[PDB]
């Protein structure tokens, strides 16, 4: 079977972490896994061959859910999993999820790339606590993702983990700018439609947009005076009605980057500047 | 709509 | 025991209905019970002595939850329960709940008047499906209420059932004027307090009052344009802030009685006239 | 309080058994309790004063749910509860339920006789595992029943326990004749009414009677060929339609007493003789 | 991967419906889906490319669970999924389930034909609300079924949907003749075996056959006098003992086609004619 | 009814607290209630007559579950509940539980003293969140307890609340010495009986005594080296085998009172001194 | 599809058993299945072609969970499934699970060998009650396992069933030596770590090893005096600390083979000889 | 009806 | 507040 | 047996 | 036995 | 550790 080759290629580099899995990224002893495998730790690593090194967690991104562990190479060469690239993934490509749940073998499951979010990988390969943090391979045996348990599983794209590799190897805080608002895409035909239901919470000022559904406690949005039911219309002068889209321009703005917000509170015209803080 | 944050 | 006397006095007039209980109000065969005992029916009555008459339901008030059944007197005199009065009930008076769950005896439970709503009687006498529709007696054995199952039970005050006795004996529709709004007593210190929570549904225009919490479907309130979040301030020119109090002036107004309503919708000044319909 | 007297009279004779309660019937050390307190045992008894005798169970009736324990009198006189009579119980009489849950006091609860089955006593006195097997007293403090936990409690009438006292003191098997059939009272207007429902199990041969609802495994009824759906009409020549009534004539017949049964199986005419066995 | 080709072939024709999926059958704008996706509607369609047409449901078969939607072709050519044939399906063939859950991509899952009912397709391809109404493809990318969510999924065979395509395109009522009886295959060795259990509902007249287990309300079977427990032996003179088989001859008979039924009710010989109505 | 008098005597002094009840102890505005009514607060008090004072919590004992609130007397005299004494309570005495759940009436329930722990009062008077913190009266209407919700309710004896009244009026910390060990009374015939079960946790060194079942985190017992399974035999030279009894001598010792403990850990002879800390 | 070949090769030999599946091992009528399919039986077999033979269970191993059924060859040749070998299984090989849930077709599911215990096979092929007892095939269609239902399924390796084939064909009792102890691998750094938790059941005598966690009722271990909390150190003189390893040497010893055990009970030095009995 | 037995 | 209606 | 209908 | 503490 | 037996 073609999967046997793939597994023979990256499988020896898939380790147990202590629960969860991980894979060795290079001969130095740089190991990738899920942040939720590293209950904050500061761990223990078992290779497929039985060797037990003592790893320490040199970085963690809770929001991307991936961590970097470090072990010290001694004796035999640390086996290494080849990194592929997730940019050229095609829906329908073979996907192989490898774990090391006990620390002496690989549990291997097979499926395809079910959907592509670049953003997130779904696959119908059985993804479970036994292979979480472990790698997801293509048919050639190069890792294109990191399994993440929560019939369709998820995996963090590999190119995503490449980006924050050094940062988590060194000082582990990745820039995740945010303002703290739960928004929802509103349509006029949902708005004035809402406005005709006598028991709707608030009347939406017609229009299309991002209806602020909730202001989260202790967030820049709260501190800027933003209220539930507000309708943000123009950031600085860019018309928006997509929640996905606003989740971006905040990121393209730095941390501690003051952003003005044009919004209307029922009838009133409101402009406030929020300062992007770090998601934590 | 999404939200998040 | 003093309760044995009481039970010997009204107990023979307590019947089974078919589930539930009832009591015979006079020798004509006028029987009181709960509306929820008469699943709409149109029934069968068993006396304590085993006699089975065939009753028909000549009236029902679903909102007061009491019904009038009629049976045809034949042979021996229908035993009759003496009616007392609930106006002079004192908290702490003995209360005896009598039922006829099988149709050949009385189940009897004993307690006190726990609280007085005139409006509703609570008692720590065991009130259960076996004695529901049955009478609640004072220490002398005169009925002061009608048990209503749903450790404290409820009973409909007897003077209340006296009022609508003839109406339910004849044509069974009792005037229950209403407008269809679920209101809540709001305080300034709850209002501007609400207004400082960023995630509260709507901003209350400060003040004290009745915050319209919900407009029920197909009600006069809906038809008058009343919306959730509206704050009714003055009916015609009578300042109100009590939900209990407004539940009254509507009643003192007839059925189909147009009532103007001064309310403010956030900032706007709103006057609407609702026409009281029949609760059903 | 009048109950304080009653409790002072029989309370010292109420013991803990080991869970459950019991009471001492005479100075010999004859103790009454529930059969379900004596998980078959063969026990330990604690008096209100702290004295711990060692009791043995000299009898058990599982179907009446009462047992006789025996302890050996030594030192101080065993306190003794006066036995009243349940024959003259009036609905509404005061009832006091006494237990000894720890073995150093009495838990006492108060209520009335809620209903009278002679057959079974119901009361609104709190009856719970703490006072089960314990006595139920009248206002004078003589026992009129034995509490039985399973808001209304049950108690075994005392005159009932008097009857089988010696038998359970000596060789513990009480004559409980039976045949093993679950019957139901059927009415023509339930029968031909059943017969017009196309999805009813079997057509009942019209008539009124005892519809055999279930034949229990390994019973005389099974061995006599009795089937579910049979309709017993005349025992030997006595028309019956009451399940309660048939539960009697079997008892008035001895154990191993052959009883013929006239029944019809749909259309066919069936006469079978069942031999009454002992309920166990 | 071979599935990537298949998906590239039919995937662009897989749309979102509004929840559920569908696929475009030709350039006219004829769309297939599940009847349970069309909560009766009368909808909105989103293509993979983001184009949102406005569809209307021109037909529905609730019992086959498939619907035909129609959209109006404008601008770019509506992509079209090639229809294969389900007649030549082999157990073990590759099966690809495609959905369009958001309206901008394909979620794709892979498996095999697990079993073949022609009647119904099972597959171990992940079938879920995200791909329901969507197509099931063979390895070449031609649709051989319609996914139906409820680890094994179901799909409506494509040749089945071809048959009722025009009918649901035009006036949407497909002939589903029926009589309304829940039958069960009975065996002598189950029959006289049943007859020896004393607590079985009814005695089966020995034989092998279709034991009428239930007569459903308001059905031809009810109107013909058919009762639970009846045993249908010969339709007009064709011996039957298979529930699957009788589910056929009724279909080969028209709607409103009178069918005589030879059955025995315990001992009696019964012949009744039921008139086949439309399942609804 | 005699209860009407009692209620007329203490009922006007029963207030609502804001959920829970309380009663006014003197004209100064000293109010008793449950500590669990005062979710730590620092409150609002409504008298039966509708007067709303503003109370503050000047003391709390979480372990006795009672609190002292203070309000400022103005206008009409604060009604006052007469304090009785719980020392002379007899099992079977009438008990009346009064609450003020809304702030304009009394809910009153009636029962008896079910059992006496001085330590704790049980009663079959309905005790619920509506009357918790409220008083429990004798037949004359003097308070003998404080209702405490969690069919039998509990009440804190009044003489107990008298003792810590001033302390909670002033600086609110009551001496509750403890060591932090969960003990269990062990018997030789339970010990060597335990020792013959092959799957019992630890072998008990025979004997009778207090088997340390659990050492609670951060307690004097933990700090003294006490382990689960230890058997304390002699405090300083007083043989003990009762858990209730040891719960005393610690109290008769002060706070920060070093107590030596003779115990054996399996075979070894162990003497440790624990220093009594404050339960919190 | 390559699986179609495989299924065409072994699929006709896959039968229904009566619930569960099985496969025919040779033309004699030797059938393999799960022991849990044969609820003890002593059965009925349906071939894919509809032929119903009458099988009897000539052997059962409850602990390996496989059974041998026998049917009598008549008429057409019994189709036969080719046996492969599980010794050379590679993780990632294709695995095809075949069942015959109704008795007229094959339900077929596809996946890979997920992990290899020789000891047990896991696969991501859908394994369910419909294919349990059925065979698991490689890509060529030779059976390498027996499906066992309980997303990853299990299968009994085929070479394992080959070993006990004759034994279960003849007299059905397979040697399963055991002693009856639930052990756990203990580490010093878990031991003295356990010993520093004040609430741990027993103090472990430091060391590494097999901590006896439980002695099961009526086992050789119980009869040898082994207690919970004992630490077995050397069998006869072989240091052990692995639960998996001890589960072996007992097997390499016969049935009724006396094995000495060096263990320490806290401080004491204990040597006991257990006699291996048969697991049942 | 009752039954029992 | 109450409501009802 | 099946049924349906 | 009781415990508490 | 495992156990079993
Ligand atoms: Na009472
Ligand atoms: Na696959
Ligand atoms: Zn799969
Ligand atoms: Zn009560």
Q: Domain segments of chain D: what residues?
A: 1-172, 173-280
Residue C232: how many other CB atoms lie within 10 Å = 22
Q: How far is the CA of E157 from the centre of ligand 2 (A)?
A: 21
- Which residues in chain I are closer than 8 Å to C185, comparing Cβ atoms? 1
Question: Which stretches of chain F are assigned E, i.e. beta strand?
Answer: 14-17, 20-26, 30-33, 45-46, 52-53, 56-61, 66-70, 94-99, 107-116, 121-123, 135-137, 143-148, 153-157, 177-178, 181-186, 209-215, 231-234, 258-265, 268-275, 277-278
Residue D31: how many other CB atoms lie within 10 Å = 27
Give G86's DSSP letter. Answer: S
- Which residues in chain A are closer than 8 Å to G92, comparing Cβ atoms? 1, 3-4, 6-7, 96, 108, 110
Q: How far is CA G186 from CA A43, G191, G198, G210, in A?
A: 19, 6, 18, 6
Biggest CA-to-CA distance, chain C: 74
Residue F120: how many other CB atoms lie within 10 Å = 14
CATH topology of domain A173-280: Pdz3 Domain (2.30.42)
Q: In degrees rounded to 5, what are phi and psi of residue A168?
A: -80, -20
Q: Which of A132, A208, A230, A262 is catalytic?
A: A132
The pairs formed by G160-164 with CB atoms below 8 angstroms and a separation of 24 or more are G160/G64, G160/G86, G161/G32, G161/G64, G161/G66, G162/G83, G164/G61, G164/G64, G164/G66
- Which residue from F92, F114, F124 is facing D4, i.e. has the nearest CB? F92
CA-based end-to-end distance of chain I: 13
Beta bridge partners of C232: C210, C263
Q: How far is CA C113 from CA A180, C34, D111, G34, in A?
A: 54, 20, 16, 68
Residues D109 and D127: beta-carbon distance below 8 Å: yes
The verdict on a CB contact (< 8 Å) between E247 and J2 is yes
Residues F33 and F155: beta-carbon distance below 8 Å: no
d(CA A143, CA A146): 8
Per-window interface: A 156-195 vs B, CB < 8 A: 178-186
The Cβ-side half-sphere exposure at A110, using a 13 Å CA radius, reads 27
The verdict on a CB contact (< 8 Å) between G106 and E91 is yes
Solved how?
X-ray
Listing from the earlier edge strand, what are the strands of the sheet with F20-26?
Answer: F52-53, F45-46, F14-17, F20-26, F30-33, F66-70, F56-61
**Chain E, nearest residue to D227 by Cα:** E198
d(CA C194, CA E154): 52
- Which residue from C93, C114, C152 is facing F1, i.e. has the nearest CB? C93
A163 Cβ contact partners less than 8 Å away, ≥ 6 residues apart: none
Residue A22: how many other CB atoms lie within 10 Å = 33
- Which residues in chain F are closer than 8 Å to G220, comparing Cβ atoms? none
Q: Which of D10, D21, D86, D132 is catalytic?
A: D132
d(CA E261, CA F1): 76
**Chain J, nearest residue to E279 by Cα:** J5
Listing from the earlier edge strand, what are the strands of the sheet with C45-46?
Answer: C52-53, C45-46, C14-17, C20-26, C30-33, C66-70, C56-61
Residue A8: how many other CB atoms lie within 10 Å = 14
By DSSP bridging, strand C121-123 and strand C107-116 are antiparallel
Which tokens sit at E42?
């009368």
Q: In degrees rounded to 5, what are phi and psi of residue B2?
A: -105, -70
- Which residue from F178, F210, F279 is facing K1, i.e. has the nearest CB? F210
CA torsion sign for D11, D17, D22, D26 is negative
Which tokens sit at F2?
């005699």
Q: How far is the CA of G89 from the centre of ligand 3 (A)?
A: 20
- Which residue from C186, C213, C279 is facing I3, i.e. has the nearest CB? C213
- F26-58 CB burial, b ≥16 within 10 A, e <16: eeebbbbbbbbbbeeeebbbbbbeeeebebebb
Q: In degrees rounded to 5, what are phi and psi of residue A234?
A: -135, 120
Q: Count of E–G CB contacts within 8 Å?
A: 49
- Which residues in chain F are closer than 8 Å to G202, comparing Cβ atoms? 201-202, 229
d(CA E58, CA D47): 84
CA torsion sign for G69, G74, G78, G83 is positive
Residues G179 and G189: beta-carbon distance below 8 Å: no
Residues A101 and A149: beta-carbon distance below 8 Å: no
By DSSP bridging, strand C181-186 and strand G181-186 are unpaired
Query: Rounded to a whole number, what is the distance in Å from the CA of L2 to chain G's nearest CA?
Result: 5
Residues D178 and H5: beta-carbon distance below 8 Å: yes
Beta bridge partners of A217: none
d(CA A123, CA E234): 54
The verdict on a CB contact (< 8 Å) between F122 and D107 is yes
Per-window interface: G 37-66 vs L, CB < 8 A: none
Q: Which of D28, D36, D93, D124 is catalytic?
A: D36
Query: Rounded to a whole number, what is the distance in Å from the CA of F65 to chain G's nearest CA?
Result: 29
d(CA D45, CA D53): 5
Q: How far is the CA of D124 from the centre of ligand 4 (A)?
A: 6
Residue G200: burial class (beta carbons within 10 Å; 0-12, 13-18, 19+): middle
Query: Rounded to a whole number, what is the distance in Å from the CA of E25 to chain J's nearest CA?
Result: 30
**Chain C, nearest residue to D138 by Cα:** C1
Residue A65 appears among annotated catalytic residues = yes
Measuring CA to CA, which residue among C19, C48, C185 is closest to residue C108? Answer: C48
Distance from chain centroid for Cα F30: 20
The verdict on a CB contact (< 8 Å) between L3 and G178 is no
The verdict on a CB contact (< 8 Å) between E1 and A116 is no
Q: Which of E10, E21, E132, E241 is catalytic?
A: E132
Q: How far is the CA of G112 from the centre of ligand 2 (A)?
A: 8
Resolution of the structure in the document, Å: 2.5
Helix/strand/coil for D264: strand
Candidates E199, E267, E270, partner chain D, best to mutate (most D CBs within 10 A): E199
Query: Rounded to a whole number, what is the distance in Å from the CA of D274 to chain E's nearest CA?
Result: 15
Which tokens sit at C80?
């009759």
Q: Span D1-172: which CATH code?
A: 2.40.10.120
C18 Cβ contact partners less than 8 Å away, ≥ 6 residues apart: C43, C44, C45, C46
Q: Count of A–E CB contacts within 8 Å?
A: 49
Give D189's DSSP letter. Answer: H
Distance from chain centroid for Cα A32: 14
Q: Which of G10, G21, G61, G65 is catalytic?
A: G65
Which tokens sit at E225?
């006098």
Residues G179 and G219: beta-carbon distance below 8 Å: yes
The verdict on a CB contact (< 8 Å) between D107 and F90 is no
- Which residues in chain K are closer than 8 Å to F244, comparing Cβ atoms? 2
- Which residues in chain C are closer than 8 Å to D152, comparing Cβ atoms? 107, 109, 126, 128
d(CA D240, CA A62): 78
Show which residues on chain H lie within 8 Å of chain D, measured between beta carbons.
Answer: 1-5
Q: Do the first three CATH levels of C1-172 and C173-280 match, i.e. the same topology?
A: no
Q: How far is the CA of F38 from the centre of ligand 4 (A)?
A: 29
By DSSP bridging, strand D45-46 and strand D14-17 are antiparallel
């Amino acid at each position: 079977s073609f999967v046997a080759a793939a597994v023979s290629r990256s499988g020896p580099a898939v380790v147990r972490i202590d629960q969860g899995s991980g894979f060795i990224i290079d001969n130095s002893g740089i190991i990738l896994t899920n942040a939720h495998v590293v209950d904050g730790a500061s761990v223990v690593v078992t290779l497929r061959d039985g060797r037990t090194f003592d790893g320490q967690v040199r970085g963690t991104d809770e929001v991307t859910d991936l961590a970097v562990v470090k072990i010290e190479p001694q004796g035999s060469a640390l086996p290494v999993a080849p990194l592929g690239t997730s940019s050229n993934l095609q829906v329908g490509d073979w996907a192989i999820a490898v774990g090391n749940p006990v620390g002496l073998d690989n549990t291997v499951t097979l499926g395809i790339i079910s959907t592509l979010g670049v953003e997130f990988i779904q696959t119908d390969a059985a993804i479970n606590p036994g292979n979480s943090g472990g790698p997801l391979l293509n048919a050639r045996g190069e890792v294109i993702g990191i399994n993440t348990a929560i019939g369709i599983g998820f995996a963090i794209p590999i190119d995503q983990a490449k980006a924050i590799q050094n940062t988590l190897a060194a000082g582990g805080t990745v820039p995740h700018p945010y303002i703290g608002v739960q928004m929802m895409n509103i349509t006029v035909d949902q708005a004035q439609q809402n406005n005709r239901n006598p028991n709707s919470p608030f009347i939406i000022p017609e229009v299309d947009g991002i209806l602020v559904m909730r202001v989260l406690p202790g967030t820049p949005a709260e501190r800027a005076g933003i209220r539930r039911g507000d309708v943000i219309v123009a950031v600085d002068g860019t018309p928006i009605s997509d929640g996905a889209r606003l989740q971006r321009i905040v990121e393209q703005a730095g941390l501690n980057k003051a952003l003005k917000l044009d919004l209307l509170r029922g009838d009133r015209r409101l402009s406030l500047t929020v300062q992007t803080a770090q998601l934590r | 709509x999404x939200x998040x944050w």
